[PDB]
Amino acid sequence: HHHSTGCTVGGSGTLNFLTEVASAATGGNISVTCDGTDPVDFTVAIDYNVYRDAARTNLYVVNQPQQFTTVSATAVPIFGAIPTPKAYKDTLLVTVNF
Amino acid sequence: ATFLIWPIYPKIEANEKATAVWLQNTGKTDAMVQIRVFKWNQDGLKDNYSEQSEIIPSPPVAKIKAGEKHMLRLTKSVNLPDGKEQSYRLIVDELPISKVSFQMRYSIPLFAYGKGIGSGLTEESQKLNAKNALAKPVLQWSVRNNSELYLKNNGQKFARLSALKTSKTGNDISLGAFGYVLSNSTVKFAIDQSTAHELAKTSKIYGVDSSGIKQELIEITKM
């Protein structure tokens, strides 16, 4: 029959890193896994910064969609870094758009 | 929170009052969600959302325990305008219950239909759409700087585009944020200079579209 696509969005854990000027980093774990015989595009927008990139040269601009697709899993990599937290905890909103 | 969501492309055909979307918390921790449906429009050349009563979700809040599969009911309140595709977003919000943490919002497209037009994802709606000249996206393209690509849909069905080609058998061009061109809508979005000039040396270009059963090429006319 005609396949109706479903996606698991987890994945299936956060980022942990006064007034010591140095550059700290961390990483977490979010995946998207559809089940089409066809790739599915999806979009991630995140509302001291965070990156899709190992080596952090690709920013999640505030409220700007960032493009993704899949094949029969896909990671939504997140890489943090810090020379707008508060206390220090931040709560970021991650929007996955199909 | 970890959710399986099915279907990711829900629709409500003309002869239907309601559809369902399933949300299963496949995590080991309980979760709470807020569920809302927004009217979706592309006026002003950008995606807008607004409060709406045409489609009502049930329940509007839910606790979904670890392993639990919940059924979202999505009810069409009254018949929608004849011959037209209405566009919505269904929004699921995870409610919270040197460390930065994560709070998910999932947003999936939802389409509903008036008489004479359908999703084309079934035999019934396919035969409905066959008898209807505009039951499909009909796209026109145009570049203009201040470089932005404008896409106008004259059809009564949205297009979901993953790629643009300058020829039927060619390769998809650069494009260093775009996908949906709703019906009777026109969308605008940024492109590279090299992209703009490359579109300048032709008049017909092609979208990779997934609005229907299969991926297919559609032709886009120069405005």
Residues of B in contact with A81 (CB under 8 A): none
Q: For the purposes of burial, counting CB atoms within 10 Å of the CB of B148, is it exposed (0-12), middle (13-18) or buried (19 or more)?
A: middle
The residues spanned by each domain of chain A are 1-98
Q: Specify the CATH number for the domain of residue B124.
A: 2.60.40.10
- Declared resolution, Å: 2.4
The CA distance from B214 to the nearest CA of chain A, in Å, is 8
The C-alpha atoms of residue B25 and residue B8 are separated, in whole angstroms, by 15
Residue B106 to residue A96, Cβ atoms within 8 A: yes
Residue of B nearest to A18 (CA): B98
Q: For the purposes of burial, counting CB atoms within 10 Å of the CB of A9, is it exposed (0-12), middle (13-18) or buried (19 or more)?
A: buried
The C-alpha atoms of residue B47 and residue B188 are separated, in whole angstroms, by 10
* Residue B45 phi, psi dihedral angles, 5° rounding: 65, 30
- The residue to which tokens 């927004």 are assigned: B38
Among B3, B102, B109, select the one facing A94 at the smallest CB separation: B102
CA-CA-CA-CA dihedral for B130, B132, B137, B141, to nearest 10: 120
The tokens describing B63, both together, are 């606790």
Please indicate if any CB of chain B lies within 8 Å of the CB of A92.
yes
Residue of B nearest to A27 (CA): B100
The tokens describing B56, both together, are 């009502």
User: Which DSSP category does B170 fall into?
Assistant: S
Among A6, A30, A43, select the one facing B6 at the smallest CB separation: A6
Residue A8 to residue B109, Cβ atoms within 8 A: no
H helices present in chain B, as ranges: 123-130, 193-200
Q: Which one, of B132, B181, B120, lies nearest residue B153 by Cα?
A: B181
The C-alpha atoms of residue B33 and residue A66 are separated, in whole angstroms, by 24
Solving technique for this entry? X-ray
Q: For the purposes of burial, counting CB atoms within 10 Å of the CB of A79, is it exposed (0-12), middle (13-18) or buried (19 or more)?
A: buried
Domain extent, residue B73, equals 3-131
Q: Which one, of B143, B100, B42, lies nearest residue A82 by Cα?
A: B100
